[PDB]
Nucleic acid binder design. Structure first.
Ligand SMILES: [Mg+2]
Ligand SMILES: [Mg+2]
Ligand SMILES: [Mg+2]
Ligand SMILES: [Mg+2]
Ligand SMILES: [Mg+2]
Length: 112
RNA sequence: GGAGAGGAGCAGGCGGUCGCGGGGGCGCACACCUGCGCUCCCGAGGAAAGUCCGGACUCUGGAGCGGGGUGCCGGGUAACGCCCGGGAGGGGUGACCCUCGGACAGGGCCAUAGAGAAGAAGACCGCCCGGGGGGAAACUUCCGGGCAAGGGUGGAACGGUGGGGUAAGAGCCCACCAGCGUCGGGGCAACCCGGCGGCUUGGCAACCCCCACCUGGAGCAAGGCCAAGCAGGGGGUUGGGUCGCUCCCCUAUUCCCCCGGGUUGGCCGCUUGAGGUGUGCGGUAACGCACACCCCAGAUUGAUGACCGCCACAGAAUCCGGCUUAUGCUCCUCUCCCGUG
RNA sequence: GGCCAGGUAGCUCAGGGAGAGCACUGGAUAUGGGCACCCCCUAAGUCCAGGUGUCGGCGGUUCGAUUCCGCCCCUGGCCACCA
């Protein structure tokens, strides 16, 4: 859903500068009110996370978590998900349910 | 069965619940442009990779030189540094694998060790001949002369080993070998086979080079179009005109260089191509030709996931031809070895 | 996606027969200290002695490669339109 996909080239700077942030050991989540009746997701994966296979797997998991849980995630925010060094350190050791739990714990705390 | 060499295919599938990307069809709104909404088709790789080569395709005004690349020979191809076939040299018992022009066109470099390393250089331990001297003799000692044959030194010592010939010795002569010069035969050829013959005189060209062939430079962030928006200023014996050098077609600010500020939107390029698959024919083969069938990702923060159930390596970003590296199996050949019918 | 650089003692940096600087380990000795000297402890410093490496890895050429010729690994940078 590309209507659900927020542009990063223009908006990342604005969200970084004007928005809020939440984090845990695996993710940093940046967010800002978008003035819409729905939320939009963006993913920023640092080059150092790895090659296409690895980065694309992470992005797919994140997109899926967001899509399936859209109903419970707060509405009216532009959201940027950033994986942390730790995650890229035990990514192969971290299962899907753990990534889901850790990401949702942050997403559900987006206020207000 | 064991050990090993060559090579070909696949990339966990099929049946279920949801979620994407591009086309098509439809539901509709269309006073234009176009704007949404919901089923059929297709949807990452053998390496998509590293960016090591070769193109195709774009933009830079001409030519020459320099520079760079390839290196036995013959084909194949759009082309190549690739592939196929064949010839020498080497390794392995063997199937097989690895190597590749020229050092009497020239210049330069060979440390250390060693008597001596490019004109034929050299006498260290030594070998033999002719005298003077000492000494009973063995042996020593001085002068003159003859050796590259033994040993030592090396990565290599100016042909190798065996015999004859020598005072003692050398292709001095002879044998087989290696090299070179020729004559004759067979190959398009690289080169092979046989005969004759003085006796022959380092290595490195992944150092410059010589010979033969090939070659501008950038790269899809190439380049073309539209929309949006701020803010211009300082320079040019001229400089710049897609690497350098030298001759040459220009252009004078509108061009180029430096500093500063505006976008950091959308469309084209963007996928049908030296393109796959199935035969038939030619060719030792790589591969070519002929007909038929197919349309096989075109994203732009970048599309393939999760749960269930019987059994790796890693993700297109302009696209092809190859190389190299990373990696899980399965099958087909051939070689050697132990054991049996 | 493409185009370039660089990898050298622990760190910064030189350059076809492996070096400087910071630096580390010792010995010397207080004008520091147990008290005030004797005796002894500790070295910020100052003397001196050195300690030391797959040349980023793996192969080839060569008698020998930091230098030459190939691949692989790691660390950085550059590109688009407007005027
Ligand atoms: Mg059996
Ligand atoms: Mg690539
Ligand atoms: Mg890459
Ligand atoms: Mg000799
Ligand atoms: Mg440009």
């Amino acid at each position: 859903t590309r209507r659900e996909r927020l542009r990063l080239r223009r908006d990342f700077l604005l969200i970084f500068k004007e928005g809020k942030s939440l984090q845990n050991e695996y993710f940093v989540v940046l967010f800002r009110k978008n003035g819409l009746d729905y939320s939009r997701l963006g993913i920023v994966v640092k080059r150092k996370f790895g090659k296409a296979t690895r980065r694309n797997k992470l992005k797919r998991w994140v997109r899926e978590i967001f899509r399936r849980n859209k109903g419970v995630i707060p509405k009216g925010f532009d959201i940027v998900v950033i994986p942390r060094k730790k995650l890229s350190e035990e990514f192969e050791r971290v299962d899907f349910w753990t990534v889901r739990e850790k990401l949702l714990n942050l997403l559900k705390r987006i206020e207000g």
